[model samples]
Target: DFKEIEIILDIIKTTREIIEDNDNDNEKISYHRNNIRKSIFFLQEELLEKYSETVCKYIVFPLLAYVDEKLMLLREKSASNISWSLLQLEYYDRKDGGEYVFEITDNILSENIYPQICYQTISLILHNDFYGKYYDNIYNHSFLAYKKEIDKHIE
Candidate 1:
């Protein structure tokens, strides 16, 4: 598990790696950053889909073997880890919150994760009847958004 997580975090680290010049007017600053995020985003979809019909199924299925939702949230272990990694995948905003604040979606596929992954994450909450009863808010949002161009490919 640690080894797999290492590769995943490496994916995140690679996503944050700035490969070009953002200061120059002619520079393709977001280019490499965009590629990295897309790769990671798509990678999860592939893995999860290959394993189950829905992201929720891929995620909650393994979760049955391991109890304790906090352990999953606090830790990175499944499709749950995918959502956590997204918010955790953030960087500094390029404007007012660019460098000083967090939750910067500059390196992310979308500005918000709520609507982006809403379809999958909401289903995750509904399927998890164990805590879904009291923790339905978890269903309400996992806070990951989709890329503007995602529908063109996924749809």
Candidate 2:
């Protein structure tokens, strides 16, 4: 069964609060980020182990929502420098069209909908640079793919 949308919303809110609090305390930012990352990883692992790929693609995505507020905060505070970090950390190169093959990793964790698949999917998307190209496709693909995944997972 799919997770409830309300639950996902709650997680997003909570995560936003955590991130906001951490924003005020640079010393604890890393610690809070790590905690959030680990929690997302754990959720992804559990969902993947229990559900099929199709089910995950459909049921898990929507349930896993992104913390838009936090992401925006990140963008503003980092002045977009973190874009490279986020892109490098979450996309793969696609050799077929000289593009990139991206997936939804962080969305899965942040939304708390499909933790299992997001764990592997996100990692896979971030790794794998193919065809010896430094194309921005990977980053673009990952972001789009994540949005698509969320659409599928939600009702």
Candidate 3:
């Protein structure tokens, strides 16, 4: 739905800030930006959409590259035991046959984060603040992916 798109866009904005603030290689940032654009486009793509949010962005959660970049920069620049926001290593992504699905792979499970920030990030993302005019089956899958991520992590 439009909510998912909006959430993804928010994450993109945060990611942009991190990238801008960090000592990331411009090439990697560009790479990340390009991938992000694809995800943005995919989220915006309807016409009975089938999206590929990219290997990094697809899970509809924090991207590992984003996490790693943030960590390295935060560690070098700031003094915090924590690094990132809204990355659950033990997580899931609700899914369908293929068109729009969710997942929690080793990438996410292994990703470390500052839970306070990440949870808040997720909290904001899932909040009911914005109900855009457009919508999609994307959230149906996202909800399922989120549930699976939850149960699997607890298990």
Candidate 4:
């Protein structure tokens, strides 16, 4: 049933804590990183692909900050290709209400695809100096704008 959801959530929490720690031990990070990938692998695809709104609220949102921090750490330590453009999310501003919409041109799903999006976005923002600043501003602005919309609905 929904029990598998709890299992994934618990693993995400553990990974979040491990990444949040100040230590930069690559091996330790890799271990927990592997755990996260495995957890995703075991997740039921049917459940994983449904409910993008809930996935954004309960999973992707909670994980984004931690993933950003982790990428920042990796960049600081000069990790090679941390900024690789393996996954990217494009968002556009909704000028009418100051909110932004995530344009999933390629059928991206939040629960299944968001980890790579978070990693690529954060790493590219932190490392690639040329377009990094542009993306940094746009991405954070889009997130905050979208966050406001999400919070409004929750109230």
Q: Which prediction has the highest TM-score against the true structure?
A: 4
lDDT of 2: 0.40
Error of 4 at 94 (Å): 24
* Cα lDDT computed for each candidate against the true fold: 0.31, 0.40, 0.39, 0.39
- Cα misplacement distance, residue 130 of candidate 2 (Å): 30
Query: Which candidate order results from sorting by TM-score in descending order?
Result: 4, 2, 3, 1
Worst 10 residues of 3 by lDDT: 94-103
- Clash list (residue pairs), candidate 1: 93-98, 112-145, 113-143, 113-144, 113-145, 116-146
Give the lDDT of residue 79 in candidate 3.
41
What is candidate 2's lDDT per residue for 39-101, written digit by digit as tens? 554555555677666544433332222332244345567532432123113311211222222
Measured over all alpha carbons after superposition, the RMSD of each candidate to the real structure, in angstroms, is 17.0, 10.6, 16.2, 10.4
> Which residues of candidate 1, in runs, are more than 4 Å off?
1-7, 19-28, 56-155
**Deviation (Å) of 130 in candidate 4:** 21
Give TM-scores for every candidate, taking all chains together and pairing residue i with residue i: 0.24, 0.38, 0.27, 0.43
- Candidate 3 has an lDDT of 0.39
Model 2 quality (TM-score) = 0.38
lDDT of 3 at 115: 23
Q: 1-155 in candidate 3: lDDT tens per residue?
A: 24444546565566657545635554555565455546544544531244343432433443333333343444556543433321223133322212222222323334543222233333333342211111344366656455345334431
